Scaffold this active site. Structure first.
Site, PDB file in Angstrom:
ATOM      1  N   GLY A  26       0.844  -1.230  -0.166  1.00  3.49           N
ATOM      2  CA  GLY A  26      -0.007   0.013  -0.100  1.00  3.49           C
ATOM      3  C   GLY A  26       0.889   1.415  -0.063  1.00  3.49           C
ATOM      4  CE  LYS A  57       7.151  -0.805   1.106  1.00  3.39           C
ATOM      5  NZ  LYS A  57       6.831  -0.368   2.267  1.00  3.39           N
ATOM      6  CG  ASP A 104       0.559  -4.139   8.194  1.00  5.99           C
ATOM      7  OD1 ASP A 104      -0.613  -4.535   8.294  1.00  5.99           O
ATOM      8  OD2 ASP A 104       1.103  -3.337   7.275  1.00  5.99           O
ATOM      9  CG  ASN A 114       4.571  -6.255   6.659  1.00  4.97           C
ATOM     10  OD1 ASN A 114       4.718  -6.154   5.293  1.00  4.97           O
ATOM     11  ND2 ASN A 114       3.736  -5.669   7.158  1.00  4.97           N
TER      12      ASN A 114
HETATM   13  C1  LIG Z   1      10.198  -3.014   3.991  1.00  4.43           C
HETATM   14  C2  LIG Z   1      10.720  -4.067   3.121  1.00  4.43           C
HETATM   15  C3  LIG Z   1       9.898  -4.681   2.065  1.00  4.43           C
HETATM   16  N1  LIG Z   1      10.627  -5.686   1.369  1.00  4.43           N
HETATM   17  C4  LIG Z   1      11.850  -6.068   1.437  1.00  4.43           C
HETATM   18  C5  LIG Z   1      12.438  -6.858   0.910  1.00  4.43           C
HETATM   19  N2  LIG Z   1      12.297  -7.774  -0.210  1.00  4.43           N
HETATM   20  C6  LIG Z   1      13.129  -8.482  -0.866  1.00  4.43           C
HETATM   21  O1  LIG Z   1      14.444  -8.567  -0.492  1.00  4.43           O
HETATM   22  C7  LIG Z   1      12.580  -9.602  -1.728  1.00  4.43           C
HETATM   23  C8  LIG Z   1      13.640 -10.666  -2.221  1.00  4.43           C
HETATM   24  N3  LIG Z   1      12.896 -11.657  -2.968  1.00  4.43           N
HETATM   25  C9  LIG Z   1      13.421 -12.607  -3.568  1.00  4.43           C
HETATM   26  C10 LIG Z   1      12.243 -13.168  -4.394  1.00  4.43           C
HETATM   27  C11 LIG Z   1      12.373 -14.462  -5.146  1.00  4.43           C
HETATM   28  C12 LIG Z   1      11.432 -14.774  -6.249  1.00  4.43           C
HETATM   29  O2  LIG Z   1      11.883 -15.965  -6.857  1.00  4.43           O
HETATM   30  C13 LIG Z   1      12.807 -16.308  -5.861  1.00  4.43           C
HETATM   31  C14 LIG Z   1      13.381 -17.433  -5.925  1.00  4.43           C
HETATM   32  C15 LIG Z   1      13.537 -15.026  -5.643  1.00  4.43           C
HETATM   33  C16 LIG Z   1      12.055 -16.069  -4.451  1.00  4.43           C
HETATM   34  N4  LIG Z   1      11.270 -12.392  -4.239  1.00  4.43           N
HETATM   35  C17 LIG Z   1      11.504 -11.689  -3.312  1.00  4.43           C
HETATM   36  N5  LIG Z   1      10.702 -10.409  -2.810  1.00  4.43           N
HETATM   37  C18 LIG Z   1      11.346  -9.733  -2.264  1.00  4.43           C
HETATM   38  O3  LIG Z   1      10.439  -8.750  -1.546  1.00  4.43           O
HETATM   39  C19 LIG Z   1       8.994  -8.856  -2.032  1.00  4.43           C
HETATM   40  C20 LIG Z   1       8.384  -9.768  -0.997  1.00  4.43           C
HETATM   41  C21 LIG Z   1       8.408  -7.351  -1.885  1.00  4.43           C
HETATM   42  C22 LIG Z   1      13.818  -7.035   1.582  1.00  4.43           C
HETATM   43  N6  LIG Z   1      13.806  -6.153   2.777  1.00  4.43           N
HETATM   44  N7  LIG Z   1      12.751  -5.526   2.755  1.00  4.43           N
HETATM   45  C23 LIG Z   1      12.092  -4.569   3.487  1.00  4.43           C
END
Ligand SMILES: Cc1cnc2c(NC(=O)c3cn4cc([C@]56CO[C@](C)(C5)C6)nc4nc3OC(C)C)cnn2c1
Length: 295
Positions: free
Chosen positions: A37, A54, A152, A157
């Protein structure tokens, strides 16, 4: 004096290492990994390090001042709160067109996505789920020990690192710690009734964590408009009213679950979901019950 602070990135460097914030999926060659959001999350690569960037925006019709406030809050909280089950902030950008927050890349994404095997990842085993539940509870315990209310808690998260360690994220609505607010925020399907009425209290985090535990046990999202019941928390009632049993709902995409520890986790969830906030366990009790579940 101001002491320790976070690195400041150039907006143009972040723009540059996310391929100009390419909103295409990673499989298509783009950089978009997820969205919420308040922003979209892009994969980036800076300083020989994979990162999550982000880029904030009003995706639920919030105001610009409120978004800036949440941006400031998450930096404030992340400055004070470091723990093995909390994500780590690497830096931020506030010079360019949009606010950005830069995090350590989490190779296994979110718990929500892994429970849904999004993009074809293999289902989490029961053994991994137990570690994830324990780690998230340790993270909530750290927050509550340090007088913070997350507001949240949900499986989107809870992020998952290179070892499937649970890392709680998204502190933009966090509150210091019972008071009533005029701006009700959070995710309806996870929210305690008192949170839905505007009350602010760490007991609400406990209820939401109970919903997360039901997601872990069943593999089902907390809300699914094409499912009966549409809200996962209503399965607790069907089980208690003996229309069903917890085994009827255990995720079938798991080859290593055992009835005793699953019922132990369901018991914790059921205690967290007591709709009287004063009857719920505190996080320290949740932690203990979860450690005993694999003892
Ligand atoms: C506040 C906040 C928000 N989001 C974050 C994040 N996100 C990430 O590092 C992140 C890393 N991956 C890796 C994969 C995959 C896709 O296929 C695979 C084999 C690789 C799994 N998908 C992800 N999605 C990610 O984020 C989403 C959930 C938004 C880190 N810190 N952080 C802090």
């Amino acid at each position: 004096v101001s002491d320790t602070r976070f690195h400041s990135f150039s907006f143009y460097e972040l723009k540059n290492v996310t391929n100009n914030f390419d909103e295409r999926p990673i499989s298509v060659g783009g950089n978009k990994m997820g969205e919420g959001g308040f922003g979209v999350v892009y994969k980036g690569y800076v300083n020989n390090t994979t990162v999550a960037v982000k880029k904030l925006a009003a995706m639920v019709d919030i105001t610009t001042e409120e978004l800036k406030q949440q941006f400031d809050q998450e930096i404030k909280v992340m400055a004070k709160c470091q723990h093995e089950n909390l994500v780590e902030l690497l830096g931020f950008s506030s010079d360019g067109d949009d606010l950005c927050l830069v995090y350590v890349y989490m190779p296994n994404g979110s718990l929500l996505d892994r429970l849904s095997c999004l993009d074809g990842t293999p289902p989490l085993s029961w053994h991994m789920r137990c570690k994830i539940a324990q780690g998230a509870a340790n993270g909530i315990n750290f927050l509550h020990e340090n007088h913070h209310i997350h507001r949240d808690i949900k499986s989107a998260n809870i992020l998952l690192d290179e070892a499937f360690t649970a890392k709680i994220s998204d502190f933009g609505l966090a509150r210091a710690s019972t008071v009533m607010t005029s701006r009700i925020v959070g995710t309806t399907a996870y929210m305690a009734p008192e949170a839905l009425r505007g009350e602010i209290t760490p007991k609400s985090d406990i209820y939401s964590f109970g919903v997360v535990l039901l997601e872990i046990i069943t593999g089902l999202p907390a809300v699914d408009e094409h499912r009966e019941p549409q809200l996962l928390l209503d399965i607790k009632e069907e089980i208690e009213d003996e229309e069903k049993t917890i085994e009827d709902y255990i995720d079938k995409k798991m080859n290593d679950a055992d009835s005793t520890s699953v019922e132990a986790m369901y018991s914790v969830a059921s205690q967290c979901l007591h709709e009287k906030k004063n009857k719920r366990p505190d996080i320290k009790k949740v932690q203990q019950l979860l450690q005993e579940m694999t003892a």
